[PDB]
Each structure stands twice: as structure tokens, then as C-alpha cells.
Design a protein around this ligand. Structure first.
Ligand SMILES: [Cl-]
Lengths: 8, 219, 219
């Protein structure tokens, strides 16, 4: 369960 | 005729799970007090995808209009913050604010480097941002470009392009311009007309936990 | 300067941006002191992909060997921690510990329900984990299954399947057993033979900030 994402 | 209660809360910094808790807490108080609307003064450089989607969902389930107000001047709703705006009943921006710049990345690396998001994640967010725009009658063409071109817009541009509903300098001008507007998404399955005639404004304080977490951040 | 030093540090909890800072701080101390190695006692149930990738990178660039030690008994290096382990110069596990369960996800819903990511992002992390394992001469078949089967292994299983190099009950057994072993990845262009005969062991205390921030994340 690695949590993946974000935005720029 | 009737006196309409409007809550105002501030939400600042990176969108994380603590941010979800803030949105949840502030919206609940307003629902319980039968408020006409809650305005959230939002200033965020971005944040986490899951917390953002949880926040959009919380706003869909809200029994009261949630107005996202990009405030104060200099603030932005960039990255995750743009999805929050697009997922809300009405968007306002103060002069000198920014919205957009949503190209997903896996994250930032050591030395100014960035970790590239695979095309699948990108396409997934294009679909999601276009869907939020379509659902709320906002410019889906331009919203895609928030991603494909890292497009960022001024308030005047955002209004002109059909992304936001209101440009306002403070709460006062916000209530006056948005009075009589219909929400862009439904509240419990009906598109609500905002009644900001005869309003009492109430400001919501951040809690101890809010203040602590963010003061650790400022350092 | 005529000494042989091994640093030991502790890393516990979610792998976040802050965890990167700790890894960087401890490894930096050991490098500046020309340590023979640093042992990181790792207990982590999960974390973020971006911080994890940055930590693997920092370990890849380390000027000294980094030994990931799943410790104390009952600890796990699940999720992000398994990637960190696989990216390092040597892996040891204490009795009663766990490695594996590495499935990538977009995160958690309001429920606490599982939000799986698109199929193609699973494939991206399969590739990444296979790469880390093959670059360190470790079993990429089992590594893939950490994701595709949510596979979790005991220390003895991890050793037999050629995923880790040492099972040790404490730092002293770890030093005795890993003495004379070659690092699984290079240190500055060269595979290095660990020299742990006559070593001085130096423990690096977590700071107040480390403990406070860990404890806050914890809840
Ligand atoms: Cl050597």
C-alpha cells in the first residue's frame, strides 16, 4: 500500500 | 425577509488529510446551524490526490452550498486546490489570485528535479478534471489545459473563460455579487438559489490542532 | 582518524517527506564522519511513493553503505519500506518481522476504504520494484509478488527466497554476520566488502522533532 500521487 | 447565516472559514497550505479534517469540521458546523452557505477562503500551492478527492466528495455530500473563495490577494488554488474549486457550488477569486497549474507529477526530487507522472495518471486526471468541469457547467476545454499546458489563470481570465462565477475583493463584495446566483452543482439534488439578502456573517476559528500543525509547517 | 565506525539510527512510522529528511540527516552524519556503514532500524507500515523514491535515490548516492534493518521484533518494512529495503546495500531482518505487501494505491476514501489506482500504475511500480531487485541482485520474481499477490514474508522466508541477506536478533549479531559481506549495490562505483572487525558502534538519537512529528503522523 504505497500511496502514489500529487500535482504541480 | 429571513436572516441568512453564512459561515466563513480559512484553509491554507498543502492539501493533506488534516485539510480534509478542516473541510469536514467547518462544513459540519455550518450544516448543523442551517446556514445559507459556507465560504472557504482557500490558499493552497497543491497537495495530495486522495485528500483532494475526499474533499471534493465531502463537498458533493454537503447539505449546504460550499463557496470556494481564492483569497487573500496573492493566494492561489493551484494543483489539488483547483479540483476542489471545480468540485464546489461556486468559485470566487480576489484580485491578484491564481487558479490552475494541475499537471500531475509523482513528486519532487532531490535537486530541483521532478519525478514524472506516467501517461496513465495524467489521462486519469484529465478525465477527472474534465468531469468536474462538465458536472458543474464549467469550461472543460480550459480545465484540461490546466493539465496539458500547466495553464494558470488570473481571476479576470478565469471568469471570462467560464471557469469561475465571481471576482470579489472581500466577503462584502462576494455576498453582493453572488446573491441571486444558482449553485453550479446541486445541494441534495436541487440547484439552489443563493439568498444573501439580510445576511449575518460568522467567522470560524481554526482549532488548536489546526494551528499547531500549520505552525510546525511555517518552520 | 584511525577508527572504524558504524552508525545506528532509528526510523519509525509512515514514510513521508519528513522521513526523507531523517534519512538524509543520518546518512549525512555518517558520511561526514567517514563511517564504515550506517544501520537503519526500520519499522514502517506504509507511506508515500514520492518520499520513498527520494529515499532510495539518496541511498543510491550514499558515500557509505546503508544497511536497512527491520527491527525491533514485530516491526515491518511493508509498503514503501520494502522498496527502501530493496534499494539498499544490505537488508537484515529481526525475528518476528515482516517484509512485503507493496501494492500501489491512490489512497483512502472517507470510509477508510481502499482506492486502488489504474492498472497501468500497478505495472509502473512492478517495473520499479523489479528494477530495484535486479540492480541489487535480489529475487525480482518474489519482489513482483510483493505487489501482484500482496505477498508478505517472514525473515527466514525472505532469506531463503533471496530477498534479504541477514537474519539477526540485535545489532551485535547483525555486525558479526554481515562482516565480510559485499554490498548488493555499489558505493561510489564499487561493490565494497564490509569491515566490521573492531568496530565502534555509535547510536544516533532521534530528535525531539523526529519523535513529535512521528507521533502526530501516527494519529
Ligand atoms: Cl572493499
Amino acid at each position: 500500500n504505497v500511496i502514489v500521487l500529487m500535482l504541480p | 425577509l429571513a436572516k441568512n447565516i453564512v459561515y466563513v472559514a480559512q484553509i491554507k497550505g498543502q492539501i493533506t488529510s488534516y485539510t480534509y479534517d478542516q473541510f469536514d469540521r467547518y462544513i459540519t458546523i455550518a450544516e448543523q446551524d442551517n446556514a445559507e452557505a459556507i465560504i472557504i477562503e482557500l490558499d493552497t500551492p497543491g497537495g495530495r490526490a486522495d485528500a483532494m478527492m475526499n474533499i471534493v466528495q465531502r463537498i458533493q455530500q454537503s447539505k449546504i452550498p460550499v463557496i470556494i473563495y481564492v483569497y487573500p490577494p496573492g493566494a492561489s488554488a493551484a494543483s489539488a486546490g483547483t479540483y476542489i474549486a471545480l468540485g464546489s457550488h461556486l468559485i470566487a477569486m480576489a484580485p491578484g489570485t491564481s487558479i490552475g497549474a494541475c499537471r500531475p507529477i509523482l513528486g519532487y526530487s532531490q535537486n530541483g528535479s521532478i519525478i514524472e507522472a506516467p501517461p496513465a495518471i495524467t489521462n486519469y486526471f484529465i478525465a477527472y478534471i474534465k468531469s468536474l468541469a462538465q458536472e458543474s457547467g464549467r469550461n472543460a476545454t480550459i480545465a484540461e489545459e490546466f493539465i496539458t499546458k500547466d495553464l494558470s489563470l488570473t481571476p479576470e481570465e478565469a471568469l471570462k473563460y467560464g471557469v469561475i462565477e465571481v471576482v470579489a475583493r472581500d466577503i462584502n463584495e462576494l455576498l453582493k455579487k453572488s446573491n441571486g446566483m444558482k449553485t453550479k452543482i446541486p445541494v441534495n439534488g436541487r440547484y439552489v438559489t443563493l439568498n444573501f439578502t439580510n445576511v449575518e456573517v460568522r467567522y470560524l476559528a481554526p482549532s488548536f490542532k489546526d494551528k499547531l500543525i500549520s505552525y510546525i509547517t511555517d518552520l
